[PDB]
Amino acid sequence: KTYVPKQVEPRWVLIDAEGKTLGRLATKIATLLRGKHRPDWTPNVAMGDFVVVVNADKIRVTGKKLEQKIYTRYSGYPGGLKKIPLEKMLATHPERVLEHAVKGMLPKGPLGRRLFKRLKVYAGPDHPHQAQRPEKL
Amino acid sequence: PKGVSVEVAPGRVKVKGPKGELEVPVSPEMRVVVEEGVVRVERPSDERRHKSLHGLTRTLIANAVKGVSEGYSKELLIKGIGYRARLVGRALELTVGFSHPVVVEPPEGITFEVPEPTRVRVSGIDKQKVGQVAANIRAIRKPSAYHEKGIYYAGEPVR
Amino acid sequence: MKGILGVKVGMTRIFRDDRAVPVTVILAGPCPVVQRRTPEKDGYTAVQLGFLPQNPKRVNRPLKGHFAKAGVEPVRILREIRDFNPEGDTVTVEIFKPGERVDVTGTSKGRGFAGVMKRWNFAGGPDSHGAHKIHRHPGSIGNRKTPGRVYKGKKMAGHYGAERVTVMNLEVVDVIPEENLLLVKGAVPGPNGGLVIVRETKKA
RNA sequence: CGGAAGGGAUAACCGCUGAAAGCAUCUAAGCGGGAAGCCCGCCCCAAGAUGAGGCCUCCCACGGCGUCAAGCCGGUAAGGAC
RNA sequence: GGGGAGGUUUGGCACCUCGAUGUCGGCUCGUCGCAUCCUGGGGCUGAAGAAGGUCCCAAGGGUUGGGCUGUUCGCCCAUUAA
RNA sequence: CCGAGCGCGGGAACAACCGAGACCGCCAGCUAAGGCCCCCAAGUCUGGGCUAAGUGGUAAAGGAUGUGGCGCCGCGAAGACA
Ligand SMILES: [Mg+2]
Ligand SMILES: [Mg+2]
Ligand SMILES: [Mg+2]
Ligand SMILES: [Mg+2]
Ligand SMILES: [Mg+2]
Ligand SMILES: [Mg+2]
Ligand SMILES: [Mg+2]
Ligand SMILES: [Mg+2]
Ligand SMILES: [Mg+2]
Ligand SMILES: [Mg+2]
Ligand SMILES: [Mg+2]
Ligand SMILES: [Mg+2]
Ligand SMILES: [Mg+2]
């Protein structure tokens, strides 16, 4: 029978974001978000590495995107289709742009939402100085 | 480029002169050479967009020189009866057919001058500024296409 | 950004210089500052204003400590006022000069589970020719298979009134500091006894 | 008593500088102006914002079982309920 | 004379429903579309001014009362920014 | 081909489009279509170009110094195009 893993300590990670393409970066963040990188993978338990990102505003994006890219927030009320361009998100809470990126690449299941928690994001940098901080590119 | 003081930077160029220093955002993929007392620039290749970038900066840098050199200034004619202009310190107020006398703010680096109630020059140190400041005046009261009134640069009559 | 608590006492009309004017009588008793919250200590500027006196026995709560933290008679009620750090230890009707307009927030009267016609001022239906069943009804509410649901926030009969309401631009008439009273341009939310706040309007 | 005022980005559109294309052009680099509309601003809801926030203030010891991990039981305090 | 869009009308198929999917108008309550009647912004005019024509941008809000007929529709009456 | 294979993979989902004809079992390996960054299995693989419109993410007659590549003819250092 295939290996039956057990409790594993959360491996935190420190991730840059300057000049990093939105999609290309989110990809690695998600794959590392779940323990999919470690050969001891197990979709059942879900034990992905705690990813913490900084320098959110620094994220690059190709061609017409700051102006073209649109987001959609729909309330249950009529006409509540409220939509926002990319430039505005960077103005308000910019961390959002990357979150809605990773969130979109995370699985639809409940545990996936549990993974989205493992994902921390800001722009300064300066994370909540906890302990772990294994830098990466 | 005599007597000037063009100093090269990464993505920009700082030109200096009798009038003063002025920044000019230079394109990224361009070589701002400083041959002798003069200045040259070359493009990384021979593509369509590159051709536009060379000629653009080619003149845009020439502006930074002339700007701090002999300075810029456009004239402004004024046709009509009550149409006139009184200089008031820095700013200039001019009644031109409106119930409210127009108060025109003087932007930094620019100092328009009033040699006559009709004629009005526009001293400056940048083509972009002076060019805008000029239109900003013609915008207040465009030339009546039925006779002579409102302000004019110096061009032909609207007739 | 002036601000002061008070209670609706009633309203009658006065005479300006020679013309009649309906005016409401507010009572802005001395409101002691309880806590000046700066952006440092919190994240926004404001001030807690106490109000009516209180039986010290009823306030056995830790509020006793909150009152002592500023050394003040135990008040009955206390609310904040955004962007407003005044002076001294107490605000007064002296804050408002006659002529200035003010916003008064209050609690409207409770009309309970009001009918739709009573609430949104609908139209109901015919009183004669039609069936004697839909006299005060809303009638239709939606379409057919599409959408097949009901638009959220649709106007329907239900509990209504007895909520936060804010009239605006009420000009402050004659203000008598001799008794802590304060006259206004009449119409004001809340019953004769409710707690109302008075702030600076936004004319410009 | 309210529609707004005022700030910001923008529609068609007017304009500055300016190539590729020695001229010219609002345009491809860049910049300004400009709608009752877009974002904010005013009024109301809102931390079930499970991403459950914040500030001020009050009470605080195990007393008997659990070797451990997690619990159980009466008296209680601030304070709450009937 | 030529090319499309739309899916509002008449029409053409007869694919779910004939062990049932109530059919015209009116009322009540509306919501959405823009190819916009008004108001807001703009180019051209055979645009002097006013007023008007036409095209562009633009849903935010607004879009009356009555006479005839079951009418939808339409004609008429008084008014309107419409 | 479905019918009777609404058993299986691909096509998001879909009787008949592409693959493939299920006697049952296996925590074996190769392959088919279509795929090989994430949700999602497999190359952010290699070399060489085209496109900056989100074309791709699929609509016409017609219209336009958009950008790249091949061939022909005229003028040009005895002086060309603007
Ligand atoms: Mg009945
Ligand atoms: Mg029905
Ligand atoms: Mg506006
Ligand atoms: Mg609350
Ligand atoms: Mg048939
Ligand atoms: Mg049936
Ligand atoms: Mg006119
Ligand atoms: Mg017009
Ligand atoms: Mg339109
Ligand atoms: Mg009739
Ligand atoms: Mg068969
Ligand atoms: Mg199939
Ligand atoms: Mg293949």
Closest CA relative to residue B138, chosen from B121, B153, B127: B153
Structure tokens that stand for C53 in this block: 């006196």
Structure tokens that stand for A67 in this block: 């102006």
Q: Closest residue to D28 by CA to C1' distance?
A: B49
Give the E-state strand segments of chain A in sequence order: 13-15, 51-53, 70-72, 83-85, 120-121, 135-136
| Distances, alpha carbon A97 to alpha carbons A69, A91, A101, C46, C98, in Å | 11, 11, 6, 34, 51
Q: How far is the CA of C202 from the centre of ligand 5 (A)?
A: 72
Collapsing DSSP to helix, strand or coil, A111 comes out as helix
Structure tokens that stand for C4 in this block: 């002061």
Query: Cα–Cα distance between C171 and C24 in angstroms, integer?
Result: 11
**Residues contacting residue B156 through CB under 8 Å, at least 6 positions apart:** none
> Reported resolution in A?
3.6
Strand B150-152 and strand C158-161: the pairing is unpaired
Structure tokens that stand for B65 in this block: 């020189």
Q: Which residues of chain A neighbour C149 with C-beta distances below 8 Å? A: none
Collapsing DSSP to helix, strand or coil, C5 comes out as strand
B140 alpha carbon, distance to own chain's centre: 18
Asked if C125 and C139 count as a contact pair (C-beta separation under 8 A), the reply is yes
Measure C107 CA to nearest chain A CA, in Å. Answer: 27
Asked if C174 and C14 count as a contact pair (C-beta separation under 8 A), the reply is yes
For an interface test with A, give the residue of C149, C150, C151 to mutate (most A CBs within 10 A).
C151
How determined? X-ray
Q: Omega of the bond prior to A125 within 30 degrees of 0, cis?
A: yes
Element (H, E) at A115: helix A110-118
Tell me, letter by letter, the H, E, C secondary structure of chain B: CCCCCCEECCCEEEECCCCCCEEEECCCCCEEECCCCCCEEECCCCCHHHHHHHHHHHHHHHHHHHHHHCCEEECCEEECCCCCCEECCCCEEECCCCCCCEEECCCCCCEEECCCCCCCEEEECCHHHHHHHHHHHHHHCCCCCCCCCEEECCCCCCC
Measure C141 CA to nearest chain A CA, in Å. Answer: 14
Asked if C77 and C59 count as a contact pair (C-beta separation under 8 A), the reply is no
Which alpha helices (DSSP H) does chain C contain, by range?
A: 63-68, 116-119
Structure tokens that stand for A12 in this block: 């935190």
Query: Cα–Cα distance between A121 and A99 in angstroms, integer?
Result: 8
Q: How far is the CA of B84 from the centre of ligand 7 (A)?
A: 22
Collapsing DSSP to helix, strand or coil, C69 comes out as coil
Q: How far is the CA of C145 from the centre of ligand 5 (A)?
A: 28
Query: Cα–Cα distance between C200 and B2 in angstroms, integer?
Result: 63
Collapsing DSSP to helix, strand or coil, A29 comes out as helix
Concatenated DSSP letters of A66-96: TTT-EEE---SSTT---EEEHHHHHHS-THH
B54 alpha carbon, distance to own chain's centre: 21
Listed by the residue before each break, gaps in chain C with C–N over 2.5 Å are none
Measure C151 CA to nearest chain A CA, in Å. Answer: 6
Asked if C36 and C12 count as a contact pair (C-beta separation under 8 A), the reply is no
Number of neighbouring beta carbons within 10 Å of residue C149: 9
Looking at chain B, which subunits does it touch, using at least 3 CB pairs closer than 8 Å as the criterion? none
For residue A63, give the nucleotide whose C1' atom is nearest its CA. Answer: F52
